[PDB]
Amino acid sequence: MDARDIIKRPVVTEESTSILDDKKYTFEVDTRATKTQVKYAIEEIFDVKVAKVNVMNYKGKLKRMGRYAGYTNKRRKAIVTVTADSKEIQFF
Amino acid sequence: MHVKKGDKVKVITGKDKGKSGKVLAAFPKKDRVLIEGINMVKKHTKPSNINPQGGILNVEAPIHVSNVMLIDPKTGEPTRVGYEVKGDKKVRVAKKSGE
Amino acid sequence: ANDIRDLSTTEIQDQEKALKEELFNLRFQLATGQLENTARIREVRKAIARMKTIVREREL
Amino acid sequence: AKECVITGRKSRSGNKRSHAMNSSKRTWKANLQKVRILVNGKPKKVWVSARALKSGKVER
RNA sequence: UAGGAAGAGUAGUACUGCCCGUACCGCAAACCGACACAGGUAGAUGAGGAGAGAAUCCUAAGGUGAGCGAGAGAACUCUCGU
RNA sequence: GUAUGAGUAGCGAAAGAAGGGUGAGAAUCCCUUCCACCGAAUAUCUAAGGUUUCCUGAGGAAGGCUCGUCCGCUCAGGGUUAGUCGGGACCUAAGCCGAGGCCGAUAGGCGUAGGCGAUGGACAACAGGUAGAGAUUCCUGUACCAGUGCUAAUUGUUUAAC
RNA sequence: GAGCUGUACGUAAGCGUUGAUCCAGAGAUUUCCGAAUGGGGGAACCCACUAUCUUUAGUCGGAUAGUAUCCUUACGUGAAUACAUAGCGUGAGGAAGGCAGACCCAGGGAACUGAAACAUCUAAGUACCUGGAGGAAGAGAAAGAAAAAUCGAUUUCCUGAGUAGCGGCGAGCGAAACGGAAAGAGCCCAAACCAAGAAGCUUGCUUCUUGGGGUUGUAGGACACUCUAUACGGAGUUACAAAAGAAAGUUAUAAAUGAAGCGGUCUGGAAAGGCCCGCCAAAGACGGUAACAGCCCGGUAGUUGAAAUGGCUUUCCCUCCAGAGUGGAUCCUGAGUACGACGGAACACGUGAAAUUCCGUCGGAAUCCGGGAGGACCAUCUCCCAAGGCUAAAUACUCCCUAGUGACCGAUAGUGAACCAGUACCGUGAGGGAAAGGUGAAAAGCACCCCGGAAGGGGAGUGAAACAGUUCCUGAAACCGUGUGCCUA
Numbered sequence A: 001m002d003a004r005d006i007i008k009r010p011v012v013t014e015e016s017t018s019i020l021d022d023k024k025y026t027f028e029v030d031t032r033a034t035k036t037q038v039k040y041a042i043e044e045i046f047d048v049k050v051a052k053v054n055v056m057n058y059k060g061k062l063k064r065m066g067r068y069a070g071y072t073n074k075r076r077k078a079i080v081t082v083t084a085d086s087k088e089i090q091f092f
Numbered sequence B: 001m002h003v004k005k006g007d008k009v010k011v012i013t014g015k016d017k018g019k020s021g022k023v024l025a026a027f028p029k030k031d032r033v034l035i036e037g038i039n040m041v042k043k044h045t046k047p048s049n050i051n052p053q054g055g056i057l058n059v060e061a062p063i064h065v066s067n068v069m070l071i072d073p074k075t076g077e078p079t080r081v082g083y084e085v086k087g088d089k090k091v092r093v094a095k096k097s098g099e
Numbered sequence C: 001a002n003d004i005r006d007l008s009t010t011e012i013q014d015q016e017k018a019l020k021e022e023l024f025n026l027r028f029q030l031a032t033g034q035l036e037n038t039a040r041i042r043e044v045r046k047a048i049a050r051m052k053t054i055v056r057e058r059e060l
Numbered sequence D: 001a002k003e004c005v006i007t008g009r010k011s012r013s014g015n016k017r018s019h020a021m022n023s024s025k026r027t028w029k030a031n032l033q034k035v036r037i038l039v040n041g042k043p044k045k046v047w048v049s050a051r052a053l054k055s056g057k058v059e060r
Numbered sequence E: 001u002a003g004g005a006a007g008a009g010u011a012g013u014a015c016u017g018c019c020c021g022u023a024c025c026g027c028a029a030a031c032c033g034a035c036a037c038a039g040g041u042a043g044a045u046g047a048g049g050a051g052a053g054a055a056u057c058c059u060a061a062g063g064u065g066a067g068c069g070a071g072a073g074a075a076c077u078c079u080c081g082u
Numbered sequence F: 001g002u003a004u005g006a007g008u009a010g011c012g013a014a015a016g017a018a019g020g021g022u023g024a025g026a027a028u029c030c031c032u033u034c035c036a037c038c039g040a041a042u043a044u045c046u047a048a049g050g051u052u053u054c055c056u057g058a059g060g061a062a063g064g065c066u067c068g069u070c071c072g073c074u075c076a077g078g079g080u081u082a083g084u085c086g087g088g089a090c091c092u093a094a095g096c097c098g099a100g101g102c103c104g105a106u107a108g109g110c111g112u113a114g115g116c117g118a119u120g121g122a123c124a125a126c127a128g129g130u131a132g133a134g135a136u137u138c139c140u141g142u143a144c145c146a147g148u149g150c151u152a153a154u155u156g157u158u159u160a161a162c
Numbered sequence G: 001g002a003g004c005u006g007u008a009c010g011u012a013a014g015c016g017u018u019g020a021u022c023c024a025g026a027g028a029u030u031u032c033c034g035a036a037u038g039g040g041g042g043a044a045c046c047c048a049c050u051a052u053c054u055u056u057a058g059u060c061g062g063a064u065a066g067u068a069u070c071c072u073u074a075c076g077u078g079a080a081u082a083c084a085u086a087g088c089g090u091g092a093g094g095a096a097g098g099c100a101g102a103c104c105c106a107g108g109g110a111a112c113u114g115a116a117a118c119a120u121c122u123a124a125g126u127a128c129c130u131g132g133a134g135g136a137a138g139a140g141a142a143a144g145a146a147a148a149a150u151c152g153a154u155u156u157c158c159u160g161a162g163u164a165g166c167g168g169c170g171a172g173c174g175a176a177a178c179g180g181a182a183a184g185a186g187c188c189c190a191a192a193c194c195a196a197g198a199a200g201c202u203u204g205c206u207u208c209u210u211g212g213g214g215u216u217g218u219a220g221g222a223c224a225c226u227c228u229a230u231a232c233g234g235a236g237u238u239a240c241a242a243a244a245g246a247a248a249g250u251u252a253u254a255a256a257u258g259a260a261g262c263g264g265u266c267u268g269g270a271a272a273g274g275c276c277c278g279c280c281a282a283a284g285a286c287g288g289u290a291a292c293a294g295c296c297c298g299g300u301a302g303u304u305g306a307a308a309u310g311g312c313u314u315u316c317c318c319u320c321c322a323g324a325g326u327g328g329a330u331c332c333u334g335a336g337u338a339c340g341a342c343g344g345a346a347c348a349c350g351u352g353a354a355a356u357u358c359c360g361u362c363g364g365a366a367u368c369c370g371g372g373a374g375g376a377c378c379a380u381c382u383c384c385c386a387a388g389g390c391u392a393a394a395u396a397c398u399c400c401c402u403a404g405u406g407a408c409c410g411a412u413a414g415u416g417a418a419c420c421a422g423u424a425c426c427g428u429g430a431g432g433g434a435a436a437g438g439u440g441a442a443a444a445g446c447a448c449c450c451c452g453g454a455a456g457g458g459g460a461g462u463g464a465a466a467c468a469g470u471u472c473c474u475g476a477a478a479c480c481g482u483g484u485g486c487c488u489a
């Protein structure tokens, strides 16, 4: 389902960059995409060969700015590891 | 607003009454006009990226539109303004039969 | 907007696909931190919306 | 549903006076009997009051 | 058994396997008691000496020194010992 | 809103001491040594419940019955990885809903087929590593369960393998 | 017609006279839940089946469309059971839910309270629950009102009148007609009779359908004849039959134009104020602008304007149409109903001398030489034709939109809520439910120096004012302090 709309954006942080050399790439995906839609979307976009996908769901944190208490957005994070014989992704 | 950016202006009332200047900006959302050399203020600004030395800054402040009359382009007097259809667009015509 | 209506309703979808790739690249660069012209995102989104609306009007 | 299918008699409400006129609520019910008649084109068991069977009907 | 039947298992290889929970407290300062409250909270494991024992005293692995103090050592009140 | 009682009652079971450090400031924060308490628990897991309280870098107005350089407090960034663990795509108990149906001023009550519903039944993974935060999930080594295609022989074809 | 990317400062990056932002009409898109409708469910979640297409070497995956239940109606199948019915399947129409805490019609229906106690009575057919609607609803074209004479459908208002009456004749309840007004409007069926079909063949008949006729009380109609008209004329989607299409005008939803003082001078931080002079006015409404403005600004009176969509009014188009007289021999004019007994209710009317209307249960007429009513009932007279249906206006209310008004409030007032209010907080839940407005004309919101870790101060500066410094106009009393004139062991 229009692969570019179920892969949102890369996750850039120390935790992600540390594993980035293990051929593991961290992405933001839709809250409805499944483990296999993500795999086929990645293979369609970046032209790689995916080996595994792991997903996890994050709640929304509770912030405030004085009298205005609300919730941050809801996240679904996917770690994609590619096979040994496949070109990498940049992020940079 | 009867005054737009780039026009010439004679101030009518206020502490700076009786002088002239050129409009530098207009704020139609709140009926304000900024005219060069009129209503100067002294801002006590801390040093920052803009104006690294800080210090007192001497800059203009907006004034109300009603305190402003548009000077007659040909003769040089403040005048009320009227609209006429010249060609296919509305132009501004003074009360001395001008533009 | 009127530059679209003379296209033969088949290259318009090619334009939509190219725009989608460009938009994905723009979000990618913004998330990484290499995007300086952030004003292009809104423009690309509105162009996609324009093309989709014209196509839908084409079929009534 | 407990009503005659020909006329439409059903239960109604009223008072139950006594000597000394102490009022109290009660109800009057129709003399509905369950009989078999041709309702539309077929035989069927329905509620029919004894007054609708007084003269002229299908069965019972 | 009734039924379905021209494909079937065998061996070797490579590949496929979805959604939800997963942090932290959990005899507790994070749960139920308005409180950083001497109360209440299901289950699994639960060592050594002496011992019948999960009693009792002292300890192991492990965990704690309790979110007001110091100094005097009166009456009286409370908990203890002759 | 502000007094009096009044700088009064209280500060919620318990053993701490000294030497270094940090800092504007230390009985109260960090480190070391000695001492002491629990030990069928005041130890280790794990359900319910809570819902970010978890980790890191800064902070000291308010909260903490004192102090605070500290914190379950304030600010900003992070952190939860499953074919095999617990639950669905498996099953049913009490109970609940219930096409037609029976009953009833209206509203509705009861109930058959059928279906939901664990606190129970069935079902394939183990041992180590992980110096900021996850581990039967990630990584290493060795496995198992269901299925699919590709090769190579075998067999069977409507008295009919399977 | 020159700025714009909301509140919201801000930085960043951009777009605009090739006409952006903005305003109005018409379109397109419209995740998930919710009647929720493919099955399930603890709300926004889980799991599918059937066809087509799609990617992979294949499993795995994706897109599109359909799939709830009931009522009505067609077609096909089809049990005990032989024909057949029930049941089953497919197709086509309709419903379901909400709410404006208002108004109104129906089903069911209290108690506290008053009677100085209480039971008949009152409160009261009120509160409330349920159903059905409509922009209004209900009622409505005499089986009427009334009396020496007449009126001519209904509804609402003023009087009648706190009258006549009802009433443990207690507390209390309490009409209607005439009279005066607002508004006005009348119609369609059933039955005799005629024409066609099929059927029970109750068998030379009847009995259903269709069309025509005809609807009234001086009785009318069917039936017979004298007349005319088959569009000459008439009517219509608000009743009287029903569905569309154009032209014109007006109006509602954006807007355009629009007169006359920079007049002089004084105080002032600033003039709209004081004094001395001018002008406009179909415009001296309102608001803003550095203090009080007809002549500074948005505007006001007046005159204009609508591409698009909706409302309204005419006209065309379209559609549909028989109405008079005379005899009335013979036939028709709403049946298990009208009434009556028993038990209740509604009528102002509590069973009473109780007429009138309605419900439950029994009995049960006449039908034009007929029937009802005129407050028991009989006779005479007068008025009127029930047991079928429809109908605008005058009337009630306001969740809303536009334009205004007030001897209405002014932050403990006025809505609970002038501010992120049905929020925070409280409760398992239904539910209860706050506090909180004001710097300044303009942020010009205190550069710089000094004490301090900071907060906070003292200068300096801005400002008319800083004793206006972010609860910031004014700043009372309680309450807490510092200094001192007189007195006090």
Ligand SMILES: [Mg+2]
Pocket (backbone or CB within 6 Å): A055, A056
């Ligand atoms: Mg998971």
Ligand SMILES: [Mg+2]
Pocket (backbone or CB within 6 Å): D023
């Ligand atoms: Mg009563």
Ligand SMILES: [Mg+2]
Pocket (backbone or CB within 6 Å): none
């Ligand atoms: Mg623990």
Ligand SMILES: [Mg+2]
Pocket (backbone or CB within 6 Å): E035
């Ligand atoms: Mg507590």
Ligand SMILES: [Mg+2]
Pocket (backbone or CB within 6 Å): E036, E067
């Ligand atoms: Mg404590």
Ligand SMILES: [Mg+2]
Pocket (backbone or CB within 6 Å): none
């Ligand atoms: Mg405790």
Ligand SMILES: [Mg+2]
Pocket (backbone or CB within 6 Å): E051
């Ligand atoms: Mg022993």
Ligand SMILES: [Mg+2]
Pocket (backbone or CB within 6 Å): none
């Ligand atoms: Mg022991």
Ligand SMILES: [Mg+2]
Pocket (backbone or CB within 6 Å): none
């Ligand atoms: Mg130890």
Ligand SMILES: [Mg+2]
Pocket (backbone or CB within 6 Å): none
């Ligand atoms: Mg201590």
Ligand SMILES: [Mg+2]
Pocket (backbone or CB within 6 Å): F008
């Ligand atoms: Mg005392």
Ligand SMILES: [Mg+2]
Pocket (backbone or CB within 6 Å): none
């Ligand atoms: Mg004490």
Ligand SMILES: [Mg+2]
Pocket (backbone or CB within 6 Å): none
């Ligand atoms: Mg303590």
Ligand SMILES: [Mg+2]
Pocket (backbone or CB within 6 Å): none
């Ligand atoms: Mg120490």
Ligand SMILES: [Mg+2]
Pocket (backbone or CB within 6 Å): none
């Ligand atoms: Mg011990």
Ligand SMILES: [Mg+2]
Pocket (backbone or CB within 6 Å): none
């Ligand atoms: Mg013990």
